[PDB]
């Protein structure tokens, strides 16, 4: 996260850190707890990965340097990557992770609410993006979970900054014309959440953008509302 600040406990209780351990352990991506055994993230977080035994999923963690050998973590039971996701194209950048055991809910470990199918994002005026990603281009993973407030931009305005990618109805964009606030490397798969009438909901999944926090280059997010049939079908069929 570029231009963000340090979060406090319980602000973002759905945020998880998706890490791998081979010989060393590292944070790779963010995710959102959406059910007691389900995390929602980006499909591209699985590109160039070994099988799922490598993954350690941390929830109820604010600060990655607070993690020790004895910190509990979740392991993966199933990975469901959207059937029509193709890496060079980038559309349908969405994936479900089923955990090996359900998590008990606490004030620091709770699921984010999901939107309805058919939702126009025009009612969301207070949106935030969180993660442990770089704080600048060519930067480094941050220890304390970062938060930043970013306005949504219309798909029409977003499309002007991105020839030659098509910005589809299944994407949502967010950024400042002047730049300086954005998601960055290591924030993939994390939440774009908006607060409406006292409650937070997941509007987007952190996906792509040009560099980080550049002028006139908004971040692009998978629009969760446009995949709610898929999310419901896949989690029900699995469960």
């Amino acid at each position: 996260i570029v231009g963000g600040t340090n979060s406090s406990w319980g602000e973002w209780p759905w945020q998880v850190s998706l890490q791998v351990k081979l010989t060393a352990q590292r944070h790779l991506c963010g995710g959102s707890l959406i059910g007691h055994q389900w995390v929602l993230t980006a499909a591209h977080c699985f590109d160039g990965l070994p099988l799922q035994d490598v993954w350690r999923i941390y929830s109820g963690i604010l600060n990655l340097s607070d993690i020790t050998k004895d910190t509990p973590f979740s392991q993966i039971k199933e990975i469901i990557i959207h059937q029509n996701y193709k890496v060079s194209e980038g559309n349908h950048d969405i994936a479900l992770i089923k955990l090996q055991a359900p998590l008990n809910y606490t004030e620091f470990q709770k699921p984010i609410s999901l939107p309805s199918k058919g939702d126009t994002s025009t009612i969301y005026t207070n949106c935030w993006v969180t993660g442990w990603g770089f704080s600048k281009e060519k930067g480094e993973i941050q220890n304390i979970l970062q938060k930043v407030n970013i306005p949504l931009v219309t798909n029409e305005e977003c499309q002007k900054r991105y020839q030659d990618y098509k910005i589809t109805q299944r994407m949502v964009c967010a950024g400042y014309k002047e730049g300086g606030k954005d998601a960055c490397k290591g924030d993939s798969g994390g939440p774009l959440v908006c607060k409406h009438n006292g409650m937070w909901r997941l509007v987007g999944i952190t996906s792509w953008g040009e560099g980080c926090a550049r002028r006139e280059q908004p971040g692009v997010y998978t629009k969760v509302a446009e995949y709610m049939d898929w999310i419901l079908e896949k989690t029900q069929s699995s469960d």
């Binding site: 790779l28 591209h44 977080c45 950048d93 792509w208």
Partner: peptide, 10 residues
């Protein structure tokens, strides 16, 4: 993954 994406080796 293409460079516009945010994983560490994109």
């Amino acid at each position: 993954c293409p460079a516009r994406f945010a994983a560490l080796w994109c």
